[PDB]
């Protein structure tokens, strides 16, 4: 724990091994961290006393890939690590798993609660975006996943013809009726339903970072430079169009948003170039402006609760803070070395 | 009245309807062009399938090598058999954490290899579906080739 103003460092030693995933609920001043060992007890501590409020224990055996507190603070979603891949909602005050669902195969890169709706939880993987509805009756909760159709790498939408039941082509009246394409060799089972052409394996948009609007929509960044809307209720997708003002002779036409955090006037994005950009977004279009330049590429970025302090973390571990309306704007809290101390 | 016939002696062939050996030979030439075109398209697709087989075998090779790398740091008691290659106090805790971690990379690489094998075999299911559609087409193409050549030989 590093204080910004006084530059003091306090160590909370995990007595059982290296700390795994990290999350904080600021309105409750609680810090929930997983321990990277056999029993992934989510240690929820309270700050500044560093007092162990609770240990959350599940059926998991390594860690949780992500921990995410709700905006209300009464719930903590955990997307578990290997090997379960269980998304579990925790009433961490009571240490009770309200619901859980195992999804082996898809690896969640980012998850986030909807701040205005604790029942909506977005999980973004490198291939899919899923919106999860926590459907409750009395004391039972269940997870209803809703995978969202993503556009192709050019931003177009693929019309999925029913592979098992193709529509009626004109029957060539000598050469047999037109069958489903996996018939004439016939792999019996789920392979015929997961059957797709490898010549028609069209790649989809890679979702990198999703952030929530005040209107329960989702800003999603792509490695192809695209910015996507996903409504948390209707799951509609419409690719944003860049307002390209004719400024010639510059190679900044491709920007890959590593992270995206919402601001009251748009989205703060960060690229691999070390540039933080301002995306001023109007209905179905966006304009990119240069907001900040950093010597090293930006890995993570977040806002303060009062939205006046801006934490920007680079790939090497360097931490910068952009204070809005104060000179100097950028202050380096941590100067990062290689970290791998050999001698 | 009457429909276009070609047998009755009262019927006389229209002079444009008069079918000659040049017409029959041109028709057989067009049919042969269609046959060669369809066969060339399917053989091009099959060559693409063969190169796709080479590519998926190479990807399975890379995944099997990564599987051996992650199994090197894996304890023996939680081992999962390698998919076959296609032919053309604190210390114990995180030690066993590493064990089950490499167990799930093992399961993920096995499931990914299974997905690639299933999708390649399903690609073969596609092109075999396009095979017997066109096999039934080219066999009748040879049949109507014989019909036209009998019409060529007689006329």
């Amino acid at each position: 724990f590093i204080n910004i103003e006084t530059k003091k460092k306090t160590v909370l030693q995990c007595s059982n091994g290296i700390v795994g995933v990290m999350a904080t609920n600021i309105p409750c001043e609680v810090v929930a961290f997983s321990d990277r060992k056999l029993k992934p007890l989510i240690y929820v501590y309270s700050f500044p006393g560093l007092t162990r409020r609770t240990k959350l224990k599940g059926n998991i055996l390594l860690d949780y890939t992500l921990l995410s507190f709700s905006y209300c603070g009464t719930y903590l979603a955990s997307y578990s690590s290997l090997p379960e891949f269980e998304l579990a909602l925790w009433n961490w005050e009571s240490s009770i798993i309200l619901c859980k669902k195992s999804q082996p195969g898809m690896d969640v890169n980012q998850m986030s609660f909807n701040p205005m709706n604790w029942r909506q939880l977005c999980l973004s993987s490198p291939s899919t975006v899923s919106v999860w509805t926590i459907e409750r009756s009395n004391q039972e909760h269940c997870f209803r996943a809703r995978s969202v159709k993503l556009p192709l790498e050019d931003g177009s939408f693929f019309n999925e013809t029913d592979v098992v039941f193709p529509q009626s082509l004109p029957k060539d009246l000598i050469y047999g009726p037109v069958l489903p394409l996996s018939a004439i060799a016939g792999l019996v089972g789920k392979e015929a339903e997961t059957f797709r052409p490898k010549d028609d394996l069209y790649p989809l948009l890679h979702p990198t970072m999703h952030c929530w609007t005040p209107t329960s929509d989702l800003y999603i960044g792509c490695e192809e430079g695209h910015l996507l809307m996903i409504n948390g209720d209707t799951l509609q997708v419409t690719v944003l169009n860049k307002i390209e003002e004719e400024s010639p002779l510059d190679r900044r036409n491709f920007i890959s948003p590593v992270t995206l955090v919402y601001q009251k006037e748009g989205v703060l994005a960060s690229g691999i170039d070390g540039f933080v950009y301002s995306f001023i977004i109007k209905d179905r279009s966006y304009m990119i402006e240069d907001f900040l330049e950093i010597e090293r590429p930006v890995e993570h970025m977040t806002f303060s609760p009062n939205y006046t302090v801006l934490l920007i973390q680079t790939d090497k571990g360097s931490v910068y803070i952009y204070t809005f309306g104060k000179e100097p704007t950028l202050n380096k809290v941590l100067d990062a070395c290689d970290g791998k101390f050999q001698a | 009245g009457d429909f276009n016939l070609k047998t009755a002696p009262d019927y006389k062939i229209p002079e444009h309807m008069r079918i000659n050996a040049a017409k029959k030979e041109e028709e057989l030439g067009h049919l042969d062009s269609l046959v060669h075109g369809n066969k060339r398209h399917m053989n091009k697709c099959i060559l693409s399938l063969r190169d796709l087989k080479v590519a998926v075998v190479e990807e399975i090779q890379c995944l099997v090598q990564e599987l051996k790398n992650i199994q090197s740091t894996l304890h023996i008691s939680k081992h999962i058999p390698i998919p076959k290659i296609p032919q053309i106090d604190v210390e114990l805790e995180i030690m066993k954490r590493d064990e089950i971690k490499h167990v799930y990379m093992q399961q993920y690489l096995v499931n990914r290899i299974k997905e690639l094998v299933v999708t390649f075999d399903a690609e073969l299911r596609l092109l075999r579906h396009q095979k017997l559609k066109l096999d039934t087409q080219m066999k009748l193409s040879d049949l109507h080739h014989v019909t036209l050549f009998q019409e060529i030989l007689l006329l």
């Binding site: 792999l187 | 041109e26 094998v117």
Partner: peptide
């Protein structure tokens, strides 16, 4: 006179296979 010989792609899990046509040059017609 051979344009492309018969090549047979086999499946991995299953015994399903596909054989290409023995392509020859088209006739003088």
């Amino acid at each position: 006179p051979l344009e492309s010989d018969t090549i047979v792609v086999h499946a991995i899990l299953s015994d399903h296979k596909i054989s290409s046509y023995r392509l020859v040059q088209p006739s003088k017609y």
